[PDB]
Amino acid sequence: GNELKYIEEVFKSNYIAPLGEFVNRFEQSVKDYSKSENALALNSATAALHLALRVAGVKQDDIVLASSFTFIASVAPICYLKAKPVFIDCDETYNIDVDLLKLAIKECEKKPKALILTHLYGNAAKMDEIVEICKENDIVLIEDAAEALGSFYKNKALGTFGEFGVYSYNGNKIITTSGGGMLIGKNKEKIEKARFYSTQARENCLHYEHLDYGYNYRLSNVLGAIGVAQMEVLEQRVLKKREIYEWYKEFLGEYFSFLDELENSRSNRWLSTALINFDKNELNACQKDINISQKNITLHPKISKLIEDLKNKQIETRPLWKAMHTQEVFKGAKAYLNGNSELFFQKGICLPSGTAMSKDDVYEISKLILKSIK
Amino acid sequence: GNELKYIEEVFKSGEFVNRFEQSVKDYSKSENALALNSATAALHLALRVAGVKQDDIVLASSFTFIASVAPICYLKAKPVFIDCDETYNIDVDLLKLAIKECEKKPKALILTHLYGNAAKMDEIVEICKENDIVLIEDAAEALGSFYKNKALGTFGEFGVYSYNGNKIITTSGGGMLIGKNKEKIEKARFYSTQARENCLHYEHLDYGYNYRLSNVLGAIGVAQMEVLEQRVLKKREIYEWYKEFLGEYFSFLDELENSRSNRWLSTALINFDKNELNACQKDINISQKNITLHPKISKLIEDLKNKQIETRPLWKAMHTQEVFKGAKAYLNGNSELFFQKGICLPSGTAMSKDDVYEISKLILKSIK
Ligand SMILES: Cc1nc(N)c(COP(=O)(O)O)c(C=O)c1O
């Protein structure tokens, strides 16, 4: 792409050009794509979530609801603010289950301030229901769309349903800046407050004056330049990820289940995932609340053997995310379970999904998988 | 000069993050280096790994940038601020007094080396050692500075360097956490990548951060380290030129004997005499405080701005900042006096002696 070209322009024009010109352009390109009105380029999606929580008014001991089936980077900002996470198990989309969300809210001893909703592997959550539940309960909806840039629900970009949304451009996301994040949101004033926090909470004057404290979270111009170049190819990459998924479905569909995107949504299929020896009747095996304690989850025998066999042929595959309600870090925290995120870990595999792959590459990988599983 | 070359290599395909850490170890002689997305992040990890918890006391330089002390706030610890001496850094007598009067043992000291100048290290290191205080050096502006031929940042249990200055948006970015203890630095490294246990799936005993430096900025860091020493020598030449041209009207306080300040920014004081130092000894409960610049300084800044030349006041001390209202500060008047009479001069390494001559002529004209 134009990554090297833009980086060179940053170095050449640094002396003369508007401050942060490529950061500004990156924010513009994300506004153009997502149709959000406000965009703030930051050094990570974790930083964007942290600022979203702080500007939303989350304080020590407030309650924040969150997805259990996620990467801990989505929920660590709850801990930064010394707020208390409440975790919710997932549905057939991999995302927060609607019934469990309702249950969790109703059983909260204190009214939750916010929900961080992950769109996992780029799949859309059930937005109509979840947006309505948050609205009715006065809960700030923060979308963790870190892996979901290029995903849509009913023709609207994931990330634009909440008061805040976050995208990531870390090294392995559909598109990358070698590290970066974007905070988007509905409220200009809130996003501008985040922008103020992102550069050490400086008052508008000649010397350094501070009424509050902030962070060093602002994206650099060099990474902003990569971000511009990456946004130029985002749509082509989303189409190619989806092609790759459809090819895996074609080759592996006899043995693996490929759960559908919600009707009238468009998952970016950032990583192709599949479930071995799975039937939908295994879903929702329970409905319960726990206080978290650490547990291991045994991978289905065919999945651990597959990862091992492929690793020996220099092909990287990975288990799915290990649910937060099984992690020692969150010992003592409340979680609402239905069995689904543990089941998906047991039977799931994350497949090579790089957009440079041809149909033959996906076929060669798939044949090795089929040979492994027998 | 190698920035683009190295970025191109990155794109052809964390080699450069590893190389950046190695180049800092090669330069500083520290045994341990961890590249992170900012110096603030580095200070945050140093405090957490030092064992600082909510309501612990952390001692810190008053005359500094808030980026150096904001991590005390992140951990909900309590800062105690200390005024400076003739080096611009923490005064040794105030430091001892602050420690003596602390209601409970302070866990750590964040010591800034302001504008590159070395603090009085023999004394400060001994004071922290005698009192069981973890010394964290904020050497964000002091990469290339030395004290008795030992690199600033390598005296503390932890030291921190920064890469690109303080504009609200920079071309590149990055910080480096160095330190004496391999296990402590590796624990910071663990925290810097979301506190993952060593296994195939994601397992977490604790929570961490996304603070690891990107490979693209690591490439730039390696290129910057390759030219660091040449830049330091140029900075020191520029400082000497300003001193030559302006030394009749401005005081250019000496670096400590047998130290080397990187002179990363040239600074000077107008209408200043040493007998003005240590004028106003007290401690306070912090309140916001406005400090009027000396009229020759405020006028200098505007005059040069109008000739399209950028200069700035010195750092405005933390003990004068609303954010730290209520916190304790030990004072002797120096950092407020330096703010009043001080100016930060253009210090770009591309300037020639004639450029510094010309800027100085404009300076002298403005002040008479
Ligand atoms: C004295 C001093 N200390 C610190 N910690 C910093 C912060 O660096 P960074 O801007 O990479 O967070 C700066 C700004 O680079 C500084 O001048």
TrEMBL record, chain A:
Protein name: Aminotransferase homolog
Membership in a protein family: Belongs to the DegT/DnrJ/EryC1 family.
Keyword Transferase part of the UniProt annotation: yes
GO MF annotation list: pyridoxal phosphate binding; UDP-2-acetamido-4-amino-2,4,6-trideoxyglucose transaminase activity
Catalytic site positions: 173
Organism of this sequence: Campylobacter jejuni
Entry's transmembrane regions: none
InterPro entries assigned: DegT/StrS_aminotransferase, PyrdxlP-dep_Trfase, PyrdxlP-dep_Trfase_major, PyrdxlP-dep_Trfase_small
GO aspect biological process, one term: polysaccharide biosynthetic process
Keywords: Aminotransferase, Pyridoxal phosphate, Transferase
Domain of life (superkingdom): Bacteria
UniProt KW Transferase keyword: yes
Pfam families referenced in this protein's UniProt entry, alphabetically: DegT_DnrJ_EryC1
Modified residue annotations for N6-(pyridoxal phosphate)lysine: 173
Binding of pyridoxal 5'-phosphate, residues: 45-46, 74, 168, 172, 216
EC numbers: 2.6.1.34
Root EC class: transferase
